[PDB]
Amino acid sequence: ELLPPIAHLYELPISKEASGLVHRTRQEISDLVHGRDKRLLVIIGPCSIHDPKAALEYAERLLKLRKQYENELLIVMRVYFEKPRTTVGWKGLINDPHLDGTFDINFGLRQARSLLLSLNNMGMPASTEFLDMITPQYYADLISWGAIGARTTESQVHRELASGLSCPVGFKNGTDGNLKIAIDAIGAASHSHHFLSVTKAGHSAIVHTGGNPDCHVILRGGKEPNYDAEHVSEAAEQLRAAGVTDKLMIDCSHANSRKDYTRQMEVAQDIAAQLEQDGGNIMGVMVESHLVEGRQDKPEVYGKSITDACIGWGATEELLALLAGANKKRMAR
Amino acid sequence: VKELLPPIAHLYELPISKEASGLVHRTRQEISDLVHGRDKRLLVIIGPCSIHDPKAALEYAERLLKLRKQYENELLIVMRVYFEKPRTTVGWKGLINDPHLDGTFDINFGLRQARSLLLSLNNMGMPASTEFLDMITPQYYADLISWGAIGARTTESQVHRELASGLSCPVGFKNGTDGNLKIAIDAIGAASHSHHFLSVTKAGHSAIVHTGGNPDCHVILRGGKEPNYDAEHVSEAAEQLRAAGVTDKLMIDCSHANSRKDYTRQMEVAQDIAAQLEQDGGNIMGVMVESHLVEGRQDKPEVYGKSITDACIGWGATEELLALLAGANKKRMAR
Amino acid sequence: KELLPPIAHLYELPISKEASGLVHRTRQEISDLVHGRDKRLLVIIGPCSIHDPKAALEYAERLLKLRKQYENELLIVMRVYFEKPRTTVGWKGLINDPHLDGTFDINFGLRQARSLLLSLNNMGMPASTEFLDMITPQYYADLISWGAIGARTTESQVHRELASGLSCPVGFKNGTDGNLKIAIDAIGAASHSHHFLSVTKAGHSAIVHTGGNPDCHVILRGGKEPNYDAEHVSEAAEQLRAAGVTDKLMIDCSHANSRKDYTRQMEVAQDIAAQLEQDGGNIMGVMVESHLVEGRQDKPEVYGKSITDACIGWGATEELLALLAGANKKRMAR
Amino acid sequence: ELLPPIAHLYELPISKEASGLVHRTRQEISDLVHGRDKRLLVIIGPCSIHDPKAALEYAERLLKLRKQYENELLIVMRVYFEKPRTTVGWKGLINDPHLDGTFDINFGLRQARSLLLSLNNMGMPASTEFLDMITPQYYADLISWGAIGARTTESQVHRELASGLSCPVGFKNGTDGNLKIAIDAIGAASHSHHFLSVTKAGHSAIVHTGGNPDCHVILRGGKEPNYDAEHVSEAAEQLRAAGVTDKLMIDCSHANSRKDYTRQMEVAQDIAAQLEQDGGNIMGVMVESHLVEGRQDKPEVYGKSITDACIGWGATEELLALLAGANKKRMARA
Ligand SMILES: C[C@H](OP(=O)(O)O)C(=O)O
Ligand SMILES: C[C@H](OP(=O)(O)O)C(=O)O
Ligand SMILES: C[C@H](OP(=O)(O)O)C(=O)O
Ligand SMILES: C[C@H](OP(=O)(O)O)C(=O)O
Ligand SMILES: [Mn+2]
Ligand SMILES: [Mn+2]
Ligand SMILES: [Mn+2]
Ligand SMILES: [Mn+2]
């Protein structure tokens, strides 16, 4: 029997501190999306959260780099709770918290909220992919930035959802490299919509959204990678042609790394080079990172991904120093 | 946030009848048989791109009904009764979302009107098909639907695969808007399995549902960068379907990216399909045709029985096309 | 079983401009009687219980002409009782068992009740009922111009709570053995704001915060002995004033005041008429159990005849209203 | 914005131990009601719970007597969360937990469940008055015995509620002494009913109850006390005449004590004397007891009632020893 959002909000109300961090971080990101600040947003963390203990440890380490680079980078943790599978598979912590096919969703949602509250309370803002239609009411108030995945960008119900989120939202290009669907998606999500959704009390209702002003595109690769300068420039021209923001984000992972975690660094280096030469259209990057590098099918090793392979903590330090140094130069112009 | 009546309210005013229930049951089975190769009739999903007027749709049904009966040994005719439309950016999302066509978004009326029409259609002997786009609306009218599509833009979406996994009707997954067929094959795999996810009950309250899987899914070739209707394309698709361990019987959409911005090309496509059915065409179990009383399209709903969404062929062309397919499939069935 | 929420019935049967206006008006007009601003006599009259809408519509049609005829002396409002409190067990009314066969088709019952109430208000006839259940009122309350809380539930806090949140005037009946203080206590209670659990138009439980009902009053319905007469009214008015609440009250001609003998309602009416002639300043209303055809029956075989408490018939009803109208015309002249 | 029962059941699931205690205690009480065991049920504790700390402390002390006297008495704590007022007033911990007019009902219901779980976990079963229609779904699973109050015994919605409780239920005679309404009530509650109620998920629904076979009456005084032998005998005769159990419970407090806390001991002494002589129709008693005696308007003194005045802990030890000694003799005859 599903507990409604209000049950979880009662046990874990948002705090003054978390509320302020979310509010502030959303604004700060808005400023990047609309070209009012030239810091580089960095969405970085695990492909998926499967352990909260490890995620809290990861956050603790990342928090120090968030503070150290705060003049060059705006660091936000990937705290992904919902995973889109190619066919079937584990859909994430909310759907299957115990990782055993028991689908204890009430526990999952509790655990997700708790972790998010803790993260915000320690000073680390959170980001996630919004995949399910009904789960967001549980934890959305604790999210500073949202992704709509490559597999759902073209979907109208996801564009509808985005249109009503209070956080900035990144739409990824399609799994074969279609960028126009993400540009279309900003157009869609920036408008007001009417559709069916569920309330904080667990009942279905008609909602009227005001539109999300702060959407942007994410280059995640397709058949071929789309990260490089030619690709960014091409994208920016298409964005301007559609009358939407020409500031975009580049995913170092996934189709841009050809599903090879050791290539995220190459992509980061290419981005760094663009930031040095010009790179005026770049406002963010995305990196799949964890305590320990690689991936594993069963959750045997602590702080190691059970979804997409991540770079480890050492490589993570390198990468952030690389980007911070490069962006400091861009901001000096 | 505005008041929404739960499904049970609409089920109370418009309960399914013995007859509609039996037609739905029977038609789902009949389609299952096509999907799994037990019957060589050709499913034909045919009707408007979208329903915007119930009067016209009832009239269209009246005429189509006679052909459904006339061709029942060769074709299994089912009407397109599409209530939910996926836009490229923004636009009118269909009768449920905006029944009045004026931006009033009177969804309670929409859902009532949709159920009423569907009940009337089934009652007169015409089965109905629609695209399932929204997650929460299906509980309102799903019991009146004999076949469902998941659109090109949502086939890759996991929530749509989940929804499909719990529908009691056969379901067609369309290839992607640029021609990706693997996403539809992946989608059958997904939807055929059991899933656990959040959904809303007949009473309007969110809940965890545990679906049993949908064994009757299949692929639809709707074009992409290049059309995928012809024999080479069908054969390539059947090989990929067999490789994935799912049914190699598929459906071909004559409309959309296969007709490539001419409604009248649907006839060319139908002719090509007819030729395949004559030569061999063993992998084809269905086709899809965008048809209305009057041909073409219009931005405003000024002309009766003319589409306000994608352009359709008219009634005359519709008669030609069905006779063509019937004649051709009679031959395939004789071998 | 799957209960439809109030909004489902409100969608099919929205209140009309006309019904809405009649309800609003009639509640005000009654308020005026309760607080002594108008000397017309409220008359709550109709069947003990509604078991057939056809008959009730026919009854209303006839009563409507007397309501118009006597509108300067009487304010006539129909008893349209959907919920019945049993001594032990029994048929609890149309909402609970509409088919009268123990099928308990409550969704139908509530639909039928609302439909009837809408039709009644639409034709010009205001409606009254006893509010017994906690959750049913959300379905039809908007169509009710006056409400009773029964003798068996007046002392109950959940009924006082419910009353506190009704937008219509409410009569509290004295207890089944004649206790009047519980009804006076009940006005105190219901006049204040309350917080308690209730169900929304959407069918979900919720905390409600009521504003209080300023239009409550007492009803004398008999006990071990009848309490209708002048000595009893005077005694009651003194107790009401002592508690700081309205000393205008209503007298039930039926039930314990008639000693469960329908032919005595007329005696009681005559005694009330005499009081209205002599003085009767504390009386603002009466209650009469009336139908098309007099008496009662266990099974619903005869049309327009009660299956609950025995009622007077249409002829006697015409007599009684003329009696009260004539008597009250005199009181108003003073 | 009201949380549904499932939210509280998720945070505070019933334990194996509490579940077993409830199950067992309900059976043991059933046995008393139907004359299969001659122990004396004792419902004892505060008039109302306003502080959980004090209630847990009270329980701790009572638990030792429950164990000491377990062969003669079956002791169960009064843990009353809902209070019926004469007019207006504080309605109990659930309605206003903070005691300040903030009506924080979500907190109240949480606190009530938590306290009840703790009580059952330590070995102390709980009893309460069921007043509200929607609150029971929150805490009912933790209750071993239920009362329907003097003010609501005649009410059909309370008889309906009772008909679906899994615990034995005592119906009190009316505030002026009417016993027949309680006998009628057992008749009613023992039958199946159909009515509207709210689910564990917080949505309204139609419920079909199976009937409660374990109801009995409670003598709690009226205009005059009804505790004595003549009154018991007279009640038993009426009970037998109605075909329901002639084993009853006697409240030492309220009308019987004449609203005087000191008086309860007298009543207990009279009951003890009946148990010695014969007292075959008595299965239970009710006592209003707390740490400290008397009452107070504001919650200034710890463990002292803010509702009806209670006897203190000392007097409580005296009373239980009195009843235990007396009932040991009754049980020896057999
Ligand atoms: C899988 C997902 O990215 P996508 O494949 O949607 O680009 C993710 O962010 O890990
Ligand atoms: C729009 C939809 O088709 P799709 O573009 O998903 O093939 C339809 O059938 O009208
Ligand atoms: C039963 C009820 O009267 P009461 O007994 O509450 O005075 C009625 O008016 O039918
Ligand atoms: C007040 C209530 O009992 P009653 O007055 O119903 O006998 C109680 O037990 O506190
Ligand atoms: Mn990933
Ligand atoms: Mn179309
Ligand atoms: Mn009556
Ligand atoms: Mn008390």
Short mmCIF file of N, CA and C and ligand atoms in Angstrom, two decimals, chain D residues 46-48 78 80 83 172 251 253-254 288 305 307-310, ligand 8:
data_model
loop_
_atom_site.label_atom_id
_atom_site.label_comp_id
_atom_site.label_asym_id
_atom_site.label_seq_id
_atom_site.Cartn_x
_atom_site.Cartn_y
_atom_site.Cartn_z
N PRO D 46 -6.96 6.66 34.43
CA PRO D 46 -7.43 8.05 34.40
C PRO D 46 -8.74 8.24 33.66
N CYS D 47 -9.45 9.32 33.99
CA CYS D 47 -10.63 9.69 33.23
C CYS D 47 -10.17 9.96 31.81
N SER D 48 -9.10 10.74 31.66
CA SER D 48 -8.50 11.01 30.35
C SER D 48 -7.00 11.03 30.41
N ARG D 78 -7.43 2.08 31.77
CA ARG D 78 -8.19 3.07 31.04
C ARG D 78 -7.16 3.95 30.37
N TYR D 80 -8.02 6.58 27.89
CA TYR D 80 -9.03 7.32 27.15
C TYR D 80 -8.45 8.54 26.41
N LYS D 83 -12.88 12.48 24.67
CA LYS D 83 -13.78 12.87 25.76
C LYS D 83 -15.05 13.61 25.28
N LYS D 172 -22.84 1.82 27.87
CA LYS D 172 -23.26 2.42 29.13
C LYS D 172 -24.69 2.83 29.10
N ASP D 251 -19.80 0.65 36.86
CA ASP D 251 -18.88 1.77 36.95
C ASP D 251 -18.99 2.34 38.35
N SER D 253 -17.45 5.08 39.19
CA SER D 253 -17.37 6.52 38.96
C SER D 253 -18.63 7.14 38.34
N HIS D 254 -18.51 8.41 37.96
CA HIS D 254 -19.58 9.14 37.29
C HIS D 254 -20.88 9.23 38.10
N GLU D 288 -12.10 5.16 38.16
CA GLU D 288 -11.34 6.32 37.71
C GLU D 288 -10.26 6.60 38.76
N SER D 305 -5.75 14.50 37.27
CA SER D 305 -6.72 14.61 36.16
C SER D 305 -7.10 16.06 35.83
N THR D 307 -9.76 16.27 33.64
CA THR D 307 -11.17 15.91 33.43
C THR D 307 -11.79 15.44 34.75
N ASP D 308 -12.65 14.42 34.72
CA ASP D 308 -13.28 13.99 35.97
C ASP D 308 -12.23 13.66 37.08
N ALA D 309 -12.60 13.97 38.32
CA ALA D 309 -11.73 13.73 39.47
C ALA D 309 -11.49 12.23 39.66
N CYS D 310 -10.25 11.83 39.98
CA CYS D 310 -9.93 10.43 40.21
C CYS D 310 -9.49 10.18 41.63
MN MN E 8 -14.74 10.35 33.48
#
